[PDB]
């Protein structure tokens, strides 16, 4: 019973964290294996952060100018490189609780949990949506650079993100675990914008099979639409258009609850030209649409 | 930047969290030291639930009928007692991953961070609210019984909150580490009501004092109050009553945006009254109060 927004469990991910300091420069890093992953701007200033020449500022540094620190025990760094926008630090010790773990680019629309940290140490988690845009709605102070956002399957942890920039809009942008920035957005103090956000449709009808499930049916209509009509109202509310792929991947849920897509469609186009009255849906007065079919599912069948 | 419902990193209490199997059923434990907490009720079948003698229930059980699994690890039992509500099973292997840890008894209003278990493995953290009614809204599936709710302060572990029934209204009930109900609520399954809840107004207001901090103050006005004026209005819409340690309380808070409480307390009269006209505030439509004056400067401050 009940539903909540749910982190997965950050043990694994905690070992993991560790302190990263260039400089006067301080930021959280990831330490797999013999490689710790960092934000490369950790070797700027904030005067360099307006236009930096990466290459030439990494140029002038050596190993012995990158200090690491695993809660107590000072790593030792044998080499550095920079892969796109993140530096790759090898130490000479291996994380002796490095978990089972890949890297992975997600797409817009999917999930993850956030470990966000400071000076190394985690801070707590929370779990966010790849915005459409490519931003995420976080919680990041100054130094909460470096803190990375996963998945866990099993045994093991999915990297998928790694917290760089907040832009002047308040959102936050960041890269996967290979330096490779998701969305337009660039690692300077630049101005950038976001563009324009929609809502993930795809979630936002998992979310209402969630309701359904936990006994809130309220919005259930005897209407019916077509996922071609249904789109042109989604297009004129900035839904994001809900392709074939999306019906087939509510299988599932629709399944599990006796309520075919295309009936849940028109229930939300009802919602969404006409509101909900004063009414809430799982104790929320707006559609929410940082679930996906599979968080649904995850949740709602107590996933270990 | 931003601000969102954020969970303690939840890695020291998942090394604690065991299967614990007596008879066909199994819930979760809590393994501290060489002592394992969980739900006195694993000892009952679902037709026990109804109205069962503990005490008699339990004497016919003896310490090689309780079944503790740590993983791979299987505890041998050495010893077994009732505490209210909680069966201590002493084991001979004591935890080599055991926090620095005390029980605590929260109080209506405060929020701790759950770590949602089945079968003695994690599934998922997420932070809830004792409500004034002593119920929490949770998500909780069979089997989910003896996940624990817990805080965090640097280096210790503060358990507040094991999980035990889920009662007819959806809402979730529980005890603290020592066996006893938050509320008045029974471990077994008879009717139980959970009586009038009401909204935490101190929370409401560190949740606007975040808003503030955060750019939204669309809400602010230039009225002011009394705080005996205010519970007028707040007593009209079942919000608990201010008292001047909240006041107090949201000290901090004051000094840090320049405004006064009773300031604050004006502009959610005025919420509360006419509503949000359809803005929102930290992206919800509707009024949160699951944020403590302390949840908020941890989350503004990045406490680690």
């Keep these: 019973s009940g539903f ?36 490369r701007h950790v070797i700027c200033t904030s005067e360099d952060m307006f236009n930096p020449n990466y290459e ?9 100018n990158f200090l690491v620190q695993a809660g107590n025990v000072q790593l030792r760094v044998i080499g550095h490189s920079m892969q796109n926008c993140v530096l790759k630090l090898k130490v000479d010790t291996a994380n002796p609780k490095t978990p089972k773990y890949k ?16 000076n190394g140490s985690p801070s707590g988690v ?11 709605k976080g919680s990041f102070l100054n130094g909460s650079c470096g803190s990375v956002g996963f998945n866990i399957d099993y045994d093991c942890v999915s990297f998928c993100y790694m917290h760089h920039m907040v832009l002047p809009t308040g959102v936050h942008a960041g890269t996967d ?23 993930i449709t795809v979630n936002v009808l998992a979310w209402l099979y969630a309701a359904v499930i936990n006994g809130d049916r309220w919005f259930l209509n005897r209407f019916t639409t077509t996922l071609n009509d249904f789109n042109l109202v989604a297009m004129k509310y900035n839904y994001e258009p809900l392709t074939q792929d999306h019906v087939d991947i ?12 295309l009936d849940m469609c028109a229930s939300l186009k009802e919602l969404l030209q006409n509101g909900m009255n004063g009414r809430t849906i799982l104790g ?19 996933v270990t």
């Design 4 to 39: 909540r927004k749910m982190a997965f469990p950050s043990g694994k991910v905690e070992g993991c964290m560790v302190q990263v300091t260039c400089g006067t420069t301080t930021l959280n890093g990831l330490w797999l294996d013999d490689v710790v992953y960092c934000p």
């Design 56 to 64: 030439d500022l990494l140029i002038r540094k050596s190993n012995h």
């Design 103 to 118: 890297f992975v680019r997600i797409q817009p629309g999917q999930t993850f949990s956030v470990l966000a940290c400071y």
């Design 126 to 136: 929370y779990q966010c949506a790849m915005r459409p845009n490519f931003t995420i």
């Design 177 to 199: 675990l290979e330096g490779n920035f998701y969305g337009p957005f660039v690692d300077r103090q630049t101005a950038q914008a976001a563009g324009t956000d929609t809502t």
């Design 250 to 261: 509510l299988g599932p849920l629709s399944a599990q609850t006796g309520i075919a897509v």
């Design 284 to 302: 929320s007065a707006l559609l929410e649409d940082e679930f996906t079919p599979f968080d649904v599912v995850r949740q709602c069948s107590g």
